[PDB]
Design an enzyme around this catalytic site. Structure first.
Site, PDB file in Angstrom:
ATOM      1  N   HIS A  62       0.886  -1.249   0.000  1.00 53.21           N
ATOM      2  CA  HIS A  62       0.000   0.000   0.000  1.00 53.21           C
ATOM      3  C   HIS A  62       0.865   1.219   0.000  1.00 53.21           C
ATOM      4  CE1 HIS A  62      -0.203  -1.392   4.365  1.00 53.21           C
ATOM      5  NE2 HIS A  62       0.316  -0.193   4.532  1.00 53.21           N
ATOM      6  N   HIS A  94       2.481   9.046   0.774  1.00 56.97           N
ATOM      7  CA  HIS A  94       1.152   8.963   0.155  1.00 56.97           C
ATOM      8  C   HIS A  94       1.250   9.880  -1.076  1.00 56.97           C
ATOM      9  CE1 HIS A  94      -0.591   6.731   3.433  1.00 56.97           C
ATOM     10  NE2 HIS A  94       0.194   7.519   4.125  1.00 56.97           N
ATOM     11  N   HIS A 117       5.045  10.773   5.911  1.00 62.48           N
ATOM     12  CA  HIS A 117       4.678  10.463   7.284  1.00 62.48           C
ATOM     13  C   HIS A 117       5.845   9.821   8.041  1.00 62.48           C
ATOM     14  CE1 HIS A 117      -0.068  10.219   6.435  1.00 62.48           C
ATOM     15  NE2 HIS A 117       0.366  11.465   6.457  1.00 62.48           N
TER      16      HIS A 117
HETATM   17 ZN   LIG Z   1       0.774   7.453   6.220  1.00 64.10          ZN
END
Ligand SMILES: [Zn+2]
Ligand SMILES: [Zn+2]
Length: 258
Positions: A62, A94, A117
């Protein structure tokens, strides 16, 4: 079936396997800059990454994670809205299929090309797994990426992506210094929220930096060549691995600056 970012297993379906998706402290959110409250009681952040030990880079299906050794206080975050020491465990991004989307958080509805992140866990809890069951278990630094000039410090990361193209692959990735990814300013917004991917646990204090870092078009392009699928499966480009903004409900965003 299992959650992802497609039409049939996308953000809109997450609630079916993770009911917390409709919870009271979901992330991400839109940062209304005219409603965020300046709070002069907030301390400056303290980022101590001089002893970071990166180990590995992994495509998990992901996103791609850069993992660090968190067996000791080597790379820590303290200060800001935080109480206690938070150890860096991994960083990931992301991003979108196009330059106009990709970030989780939005600033006055503006979306960025991506969002980094840096994930940290509260050392009082002894391990990452116990930390995620606590309301103040994690600290996540969010940094926006806009497309412009190349970020020299990100190049080592871009160059290894060829080797972890599909889900489940990993590569040794040592001696990577996360300080090369920080903006010049540490001014931030902060609010109580959750993880932005399943299991969407409400355990995070978000620290969203004001200043975005710039990456070149060529750098972001490399991100978009990764795959969501495992080797030998039909090709599905890893793009748009972001979730729509969630209602703020009973929360207040605080700013470290005016
Ligand atoms: Zn994240
Ligand atoms: Zn929790």
């Amino acid at each position: 079936h299992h959650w992802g970012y497609g039409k049939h297993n996308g953000p809109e379906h997450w609630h079916k396997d993770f009911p917390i998706a409709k919870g009271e402290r979901q992330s991400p959110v839109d940062i209304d800059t005219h409603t965020a409250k300046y709070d002069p009681s907030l301390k400056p952040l303290s980022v101590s990454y001089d002893q970071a030990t990166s180990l590995r880079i992994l495509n998990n299906g992901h996103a791609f994670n850069v993992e660090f050794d968190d067996s000791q206080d080597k790379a820590v975050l303290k200060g800001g809205p935080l109480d206690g020491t938070y150890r860096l465990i991994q960083f990931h991004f992301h991003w979108g299929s196009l330059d106009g989307q990709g970030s989780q958080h939005t600033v006055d509805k503006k979306k960025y090309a991506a969002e980094l992140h840096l994930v940290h866990w509260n050392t009082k809890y002894g391990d990452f797994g116990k930390a995620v069951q606590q309301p103040d278990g994690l600290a996540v630094l969010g940094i926006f990426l806009k497309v412009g000039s190349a970020k020299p410090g990100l190049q080592k990361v871009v160059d290894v992506l060829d080797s972890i193209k599909t889900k489940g692959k990993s590569a040794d990735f040592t001696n990577f210094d996360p300080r090369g990814l920080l903006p010049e300013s540490l001014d931030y917004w902060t609010y109580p929220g959750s993880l932005t991917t399943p299991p969407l646990l409400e355990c995070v204090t978000w620290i969203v930096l004001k200043e975005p870092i710039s990456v070149s078009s060529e750098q972001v392009l490399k991100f978009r060549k990764l795959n969501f699928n495992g080797e030998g499966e039909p090709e599905e480009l890893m793009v748009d691995n972001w979730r729509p903004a969630q209602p703020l409900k009973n929360r207040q965003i605080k700013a470290s600056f005016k």
